[PDB]
Amino acid sequence: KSPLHFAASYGRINTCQRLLQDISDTRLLNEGDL
Amino acid sequence: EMEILKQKYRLKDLTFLLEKQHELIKLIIQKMEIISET
Amino acid sequence: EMEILKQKYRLKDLTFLLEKQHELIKLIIQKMEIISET
């Protein structure tokens, strides 16, 4: 949640892919900030 | 006029040096591990 | 004239301070381990 918002904000590549190992998880993938 | 013109080329070189610094400072954030701060 | 001339010496000191900063910022990249980003 909050890490993937952080890690994608700064281009950290390998952080995202292990966060995107949870396949069919679109709700936090398109989750919004405040 | 040439006093300001010499200052322009030094400032334009300065902001160009700040680009490569800022882009490289983007790169350390892109490649640095973190555990404790999570 | 001396107003711009005083500004030139402050700018020339500024870009000199930016050299040692940028060279040292090169040094942190030279010496920093990485595991997670690979």
Question: Is A26 strand, coil or helix?
Answer: coil
A10 vs B10: CA distance, rounded Å: 31
From residue C22, give the alpha-carbon distance in Å to each of A20, B26, C13, C19: 35, 13, 14, 5
Q: Which of C3, C21, A4 is nearest to B14 (CA)?
A: C21
Which residues in chain A are contacts of B26 at CB distance < 8 A? Answer: 10-11
All residues at 6 or more sequence positions from A8 whose CB lies less than 8 Å from its CB, including other chains: A16
A15 vs B35: CA distance, rounded Å: 12
Q: Which two tokens stand for residue C27?
A: 């040094």
Q: Tell me the CB-side half-sphere exposure of residue B25, using CA atoms within 13 A.
A: 11
Q: Tell me the CB-side half-sphere exposure of residue A27, using CA atoms within 13 A.
A: 0
Q: Do A11 and B29 touch (CB under 8 A)?
A: yes
Residue with tokens 């990249």: C29
Number of residues assigned to chain A: 34
- A11: contact with B, CB 8 A cutoff: yes
**Cβ atoms B21, C22 nearer than 8 A:** yes
Q: Do B29 and A13 touch (CB under 8 A)?
A: no
**Between chain B and chain C, how many beta carbons pairs sit less than 8 Å apart?**
46
For every residue of C17-33, DSSP letters joined together read HHHHHHHHHHHHHHS--
CA angle A10–A15–A17, rounded 5-degree value: 115
Q: Do A12 and B29 touch (CB under 8 A)?
A: yes
> Resolution of this entry in Å?
3.6
Q: Which two tokens stand for residue A15?
A: 């952080």
